[model samples]
Target: EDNYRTIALAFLDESADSTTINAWVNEFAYQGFDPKRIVQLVKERGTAKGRDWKKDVKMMIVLNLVDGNEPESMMKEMSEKGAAIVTQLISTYQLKEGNPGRDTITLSRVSAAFVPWTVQALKTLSESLPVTGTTMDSIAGTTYPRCMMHPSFAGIIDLELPNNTGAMLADAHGLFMLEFSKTINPSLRTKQPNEIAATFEKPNMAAMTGRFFTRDDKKKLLIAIGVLNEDLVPNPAIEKCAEKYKAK
Candidate 1:
């Protein structure tokens, strides 16, 4: 019953060695996540869970990203951790008194939604965003919007970071802003994270075709912390977009 992800375990149990770690990262890379980026993340955050092999390997296997505002360890639910974040979330939520589907999420799409969501909203959210604000903005070479916290329903998702995360957040927040540039058309800056999540339905498809993506973490973060969103203060020059929003 529990013999599916043997590769994940095999890769981990190999003293969690670097060569073996490379193989594990390969699994993720095969899944479309960038290999080098994963390596960088591992090198930087690998020891975050204590360098012990068993502990570190599990973390690496399920290593996911979170906002700086939240404790990474806060995601833990059980003592012997081997479950994927999606598995834990769905399984735990199923414990609810009144539920429609009794079947748990799985990889193959037979009875349930084969939605295996990666925990690192940072990567999913920023995977394809080109230096945002708009495609025209990127081509115009004037994307510097003096990103600032704007406040929206989307702590719904936060930070979406890693420094690499900075640009990622920049795109998620900026492109999101560009889409709603028509601040007058109040279709939905957002009624809630769930709706904002619905906001991503298009992005996933769009990314495959070389367009932008809107992963979650930054959704609410952009709303709440405009620091990443376009708030005036241009950069091709300066003081132009600067002192622009002082009155408002």
Candidate 2:
């Protein structure tokens, strides 16, 4: 049944020029949900029994969009009849009562009315939250907040890292900073681990340091992260890490 649902959905997504939709509508019209033997298959081979046929019908209903430009009318009629069959099947099998059962059929009855209601709600909510805030203060760049509990250390630092033979430290620093932004602070050496790690150790630094990202700065940071990760960063280390932690 899951495989059937998958295949059915894939067919709908790929049915570009209405070829598949026309064929499918014809098949459903002829078979009338019984010829496919899905009903009997559910009865004999299905895992969760009671009214599984209803689920198959609902899955088939998703393909109604493929029925062409007149899907609104065709789907309305089909939904009416198909929903009745599903309701009867559910009641006959005494299917577990809930959204998956009779409630689903009830929703299908007013599905057309609800579509406009859904669109209105979406429009209302979308207008409330946009890609940008309209307020002048909101539009301006704010100070970048720092973290608390900044760590501090006073000692001769040896910091012996692995093979420093390949890239220059400056090149590696920029690359490392870019990668670090994915999980940590992104502002070049400004958001360096020493500063970031310090925030965790010292709380007051958050307010003291007021470096924030500008619109252009944020864009560049994003691009840097993406390009550096794709081209400059070593893949062998990532592969090794995945090989170590990947599930068996």
Best by lDDT: 1
Q: For model 1, how does the per-residue alpha-carbon lDDT over 1-248 read when each residue is reduced to its tens digit?
A: 46868866686656657888998776564132222233333334434533432333223222322111112333354335533543343332221221122232111111011011222222333323222234434532344332321112122233233333333433443334434323323455545434543454343322222212244434433433333334321232122222321222
RMSD (Cα, Å) for all candidates, in order, is 20.9, 25.8
Judge candidate 2 against the unseen true structure and give its global Cα lDDT, from 0 to 1: 0.29
- Misplaced by over 4 Å in model 2 are 1-42, 45-79, 99-248
Top candidate when judged by TM-score against the true structure: 1
Q: Compute each candidate's TM-score over C-alphas.
A: 0.20, 0.14
What is the per-residue lDDT of model 2 for residues 1-248, given as tens digits with 9 covering 90 to 100? 56987888788666365888887776565221111232333334323554455454433222221221122334355677765654453444333321232222322222221222222222223223211122211321321111100010000001121232112222222222222332323343445445544433232132112123233432233234231232234334323322222221
Cα misplacement distance, residue 211 of candidate 2 (Å): 50
